[PDB]
Amino acid sequence: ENLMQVYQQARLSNPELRKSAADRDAAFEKINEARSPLLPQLGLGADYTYSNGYRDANGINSNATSASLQLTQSIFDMSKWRALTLQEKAAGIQDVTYQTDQQTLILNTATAYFNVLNAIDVLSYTQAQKEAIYRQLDQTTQRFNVGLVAITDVQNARAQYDTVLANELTARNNLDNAVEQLRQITGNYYPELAALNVENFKTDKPQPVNALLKEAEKRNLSLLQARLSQDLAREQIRQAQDGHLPTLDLTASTGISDTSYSGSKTRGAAGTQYDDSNMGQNKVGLSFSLPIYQGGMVNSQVKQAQYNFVGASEQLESAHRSVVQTVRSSFNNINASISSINAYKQAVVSAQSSLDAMEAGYSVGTRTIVDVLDATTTLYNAKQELANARYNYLINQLNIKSALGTLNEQDLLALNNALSKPVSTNPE
Amino acid sequence: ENLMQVYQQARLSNPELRKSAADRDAAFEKINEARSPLLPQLGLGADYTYSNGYRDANGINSNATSASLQLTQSIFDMSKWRALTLQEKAAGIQDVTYQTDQQTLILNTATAYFNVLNAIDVLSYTQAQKEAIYRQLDQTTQRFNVGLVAITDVQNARAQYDTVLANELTARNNLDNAVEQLRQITGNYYPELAALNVENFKTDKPQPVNALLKEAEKRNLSLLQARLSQDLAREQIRQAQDGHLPTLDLTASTGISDTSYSGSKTRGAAGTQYDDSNMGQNKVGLSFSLPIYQGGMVNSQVKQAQYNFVGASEQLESAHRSVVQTVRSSFNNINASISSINAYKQAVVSAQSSLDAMEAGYSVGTRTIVDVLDATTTLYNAKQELANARYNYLINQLNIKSALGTLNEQDLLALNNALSKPVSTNPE
Amino acid sequence: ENLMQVYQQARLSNPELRKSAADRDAAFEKINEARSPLLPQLGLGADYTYSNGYRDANGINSNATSASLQLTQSIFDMSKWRALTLQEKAAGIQDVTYQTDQQTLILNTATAYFNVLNAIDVLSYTQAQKEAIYRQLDQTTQRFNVGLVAITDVQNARAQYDTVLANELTARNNLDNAVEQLRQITGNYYPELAALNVENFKTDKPQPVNALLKEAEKRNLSLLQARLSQDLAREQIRQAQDGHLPTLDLTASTGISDTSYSGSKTRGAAGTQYDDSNMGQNKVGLSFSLPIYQGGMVNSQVKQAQYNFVGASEQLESAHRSVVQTVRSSFNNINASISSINAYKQAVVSAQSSLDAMEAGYSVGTRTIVDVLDATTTLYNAKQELANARYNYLINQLNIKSALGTLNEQDLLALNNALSKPVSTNPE
DSSP states (O other), X not given: OOHHHHHHHXXXXXXHHHHHHHHHHHHHHHHHHHHGGGSOEEEEEEEEEEEEEOSSSTXXXXXXXXXXXXXXXXXXXXHHHHHHHHHHHHHHHHHHHHHXXXXXXXXXXXXXXXXXXXXXXXXXXXXHHHHHHHHHHHHHHHHHHXXXXXXXXXXXXXXXXXXXXXXXXXXXXXXXXXXXXXXXXXXXXXXXXXXXXXXXXXXXXXXXXXXXXXXXXXXXXXXXXXXXXXXXXXXXXXXXXXXXXXXXXEEEEXXXXXXXXXXXXXXXXXXXXXXXXXXXXXXXXXXXXXXXXXXXXXXXXXXXXXXXXXXXXXXXXXXXXXXXXXXXXXXXXXXXXHHHXXXXXXXXXXXXXXXHHHHHHHHHTSSOHHHHHHHHHHHHHHXXXXXHHHHHHHHHHHHHHHHHTOOOHHHHHHHXXXXXXXXXXSOO | OOHHHHHHHHHHHOHHHHHHHHHXXXXXXXXXXXXXXXXXXXXXXXXXXXXEEOSSSTTXXXXXXXXXXXXXXXXXXXXXXXXXXXXXXXHHHHHHHHHHHHHHHHHHHHHHXXXXXXXXXXXXXXXXXXXXXXXXHHHHHHHHHTTSSXXXXXXXXXXXHHHHHHHHHHHHHHHHHHHHHHHHHHXXXXXXXXXXXXXXXXXXXXXXXXXHHHHHHHHOHHHHHHHHHHHHHHHHHHHHHGGXXXXXXXXXXXXXXXXXXXXXXXXXXOOXXXXXXXOEEEEXXXXXXXXXXXXXXXXXXXXXXXXXXXXXXXXXXXXXXXXXXXXXXHHHHHHHHHHHHHHHHHHHHHHHHHHHHHHHHHHTTSSOHHHHHHHHHHHHHHHXXXXXXXXXXXXXXXXXXXXXXXXXXXXXXXXXXXXEEEEESSOO | OOHHHHHHHHHHHOHHHHHHHHHHHHHHHHHHHHHGGGSOEXXXXXXXXXXXXXXXXXXXXXXXXXXXXXXXXXXXXXXXHHHHHHHHXXXXXXXXXXXXXHHHHHHHHHHHHHHHHHHXXXXXXXXXXXXXXXXXXXXXXXXXHTTSSOHHHHHHHHHHHHHHHHHHHHHHHHHHHHHHHHHHHHSOOOSEEEEEXXXXXXXXXXXXXHHHHHHHHHHOHHHHHHHHHHHHHHHHHHHHHGGGSOEEEEEEEEEEEOOEEESXXXXXXXXXXXXXXXXXXXXXXXXXXXXXXXXXXXHHHHHHHHHHHHHHHHHHHHHHHHHHHHHHHHHHHHHHHHHHHHHHHHHHHHHHHHHHHHHHHHHTTXXXXXXHHHHHHHHHHHHHHHHHHHHHHHHHHHHHHHHHTOOOHHXXXXXXXXXXXXXXXXXX
């Protein structure tokens, strides 16, 4: 029901965040798979083979059986160390994307919550406007019947009333649909929410834009991620460069093998060559391999990776322009919000005083009922705009925190303290 | 020209669906490629080698020639069966995406068709409102000439007339662009379409939302596909698990080889060893292989696949939330649409009767020409809003059917039966 | 400050384009990697092995050392030539994508520049409207104090003034935010730009749509790219077909090897077999390989590739429909913009002449101050729409040139010649 409770219900079940946590876990777990080629590899092989000689070896047949334990162990292989470090950097990037998604849940939840309260206000103002027009229509009908006004005033007020009835259907539909957006993020249906306290509401000027820009440059999650990706690209050049280096591996095994020969030519001038052998061997060996020249393959991979590094550097400069754009437009939007709140508080007072003047002028003939109905629309429109500018102020405070890289649960708790009374999300 | 005909023309040529049918076809065909490793592999090899001995083998040279047919056949390999089953599942997924795409074509075609009809109505109303203002301007001009009204009435009417002339250009442009949207889906330009039969138009209350929700849960295509993905992620854990198991392969071959030696040291104390050999061999063998330990590689692949399955499970919950949002917001929109239609029908009657009241009021001095022009705008705006609310009702019916997973050609035929007379997509 | 200078500053530093240039460079460079298998491969190997006999060869031990230079060279391998031609084609595609991106920067830069000029005009008309309603409110407050008008006129004027104060806040915020959009593309903050020269502004009718369509078919960059993608898909069928062909390779090497045996059974009825050997070998050999039958693998790959080509063919049709939609809708929009410019010029003349009539009528009592303030809103709305329509006309010219495939720096220069005096992007 209040924003803290909605967000807590969202945080445990949100499937977009939960999927992101899964991606993160897989990426960390993958460090174990990337480390694996640097550890001992041990397999068991075993076979049987039947051979049948012919054409100049006709008469010599055999069947062999072999079985062995083989072991490989990397001694020097930069490329295998490089893959491990590449996977560790990939996990690091996935972690930041998780942090980015956590902050997105808070912003999206608080946004949907205020979208509900904003639709509740629109609908409540639309109904208050319907009831004021309805009173004008009612008093005008009574006056017409007693000869104080022409039937024209009833017919103009009825047309107006029918228009506000139609607007009420749409205000109502927008509130039902905002309620479903909130169920989509949170999983739940809320019949009532804690409303904004407008008797205690206040606005605060934001910190200077230079200071917000500095803090963003240190803490924005998108730009940390772009910096991690540029570093990853740099590591990928080293990986390309590793194709030039030699490798040194260790091998080891123990296997046995039988072999029995048979047929016309097994003996008789063979000389022990086709007897039965029952080998047994224990080996340990070192293997060294050095490239020298592969058609330009390496070198081309290096140069591609260098270009890839400049592309990642252009992405970092893109990310930087994006956080400048987001914090400066967020700063601007909060300042325009505060100025709109102030301009629409004043517009409500002067629209209410213009409405009472239209009523006074109508009772002495210098205004018509149309002037009174038009002034009722101007008042209710101003009231709507004032209520929406305050939600836009609160959303923009969220957006600025998000562009700093620090929107968190305490910020939700500070927004939650500006709430107070319950209001139904499905009134009549 | 009617919606049935437009759709039939779209269905044979639409490139987006035809691309999807190609993806599906390739995915099914790929099952044969995934099955292939389970079948006999047979190849022909042949070579010639020249050797020139040296340093303790100087004097012994040779040139060999060999050639053989080799055959391999998988006997036991879980991973090869698993790849086949994975490809079958991928084809299954691709088949549901094709179904999803076939339904999208229907929804997109019907939506574009009604958008043209809706742009036609806007343009027709903007022209009717033009003509009604033109008649007011013409009659005011005549009455000014005869001394019955001030020139202020002509001037106020001219300014409003000019505003609606500018509106007509924009209404026309929206019509031309809706027409190009339809050409892009369909491939064709339609100079006329069958309009909505408003004389016979009726609305029907939707089935209760719980029942639409149950049906969507059973048939929605998105959620069937998310279920099929979750199952595929489950199969991928098994595939990871298969890396622990042993393999059993069969090999077979037949090959010949020559070999002639030569040089200083071929004979003289050689001992037959360097004569000429003309081997011939027929082999058949079995090869068994068993992993034992690979640095934790398997296990890590298993755990990653388990995280991946949880990711797929969160994606299924996301898909569920999205179908719930789509059916509940489509249901609300349909009900709101029916209420808007009713509200606007009534608003057109009170607007018309208020416009007639402004004209009587003007003729006795209690209203001005400005009230008559304003009441003409109020009337045409309400007529527009009614015509739009009907298209919105019909579009939301389409959307709800699509969220159930059952939008089909009979539904298109039911919409086509709501159409009648031809109207031009390019009038003057 | 003028469009030519903004664009030059954008073109040297835009990171989105520079990333695109890096991608293209990597793709071209990759041609060297694809060619690499076709050139000599040469490597150095060297090892040491210790063996320890047992079970029927217990007593015979050894440690060997070997080292060789190995060289491979492809003689006949269609698949290797094919991979080269495929990479060349991928380079060709990437080059067109770079050409596309270069045109996008011209389009985005010119669009954002005109968005700032449009938002300057909105704000300046909003302020001009604020000042006109302030004069009405001032002149009415003085007539009120001298007894010439009731207080109801002051109250209606003040409510209206307040509504334009709130509009100014939002017009000023839209201008700050368009300035930040421009800074994002360009890298810079401009405190003044060269304004559209409206004294010299003219419109020109576009070429006939059939002619624009013909030229787009010949030059649109998206559809050139779709054509190259269809060609690439054609090449991929051949690549698949290559899996049936035989290969012919060349091998060569020079290596030495030692081997010293040892233990109980080295001699004594050995027979020279376990003496010390110091081999040396120089080789050159040819290796031929021919597939024959692989479980249906090839063939299935061919079929998949043929489906993939139809998919690419459907994409080409999609791209054509998209260029038709873009050229026909841009053509429509330009013509509509020209009609809009003409209609709003006329609407400002009739709106100004209706405001002057509201003033004469107010001074003789046939209109109220409310008519005067309403006619002031009509007048400034029409002036805003005219100014907007000119920017819309210019932006559509840009869009049409971009749909033809020929937007370039001479087009920018032609736009820059429609500019003149500086106006500030942050006024008060």
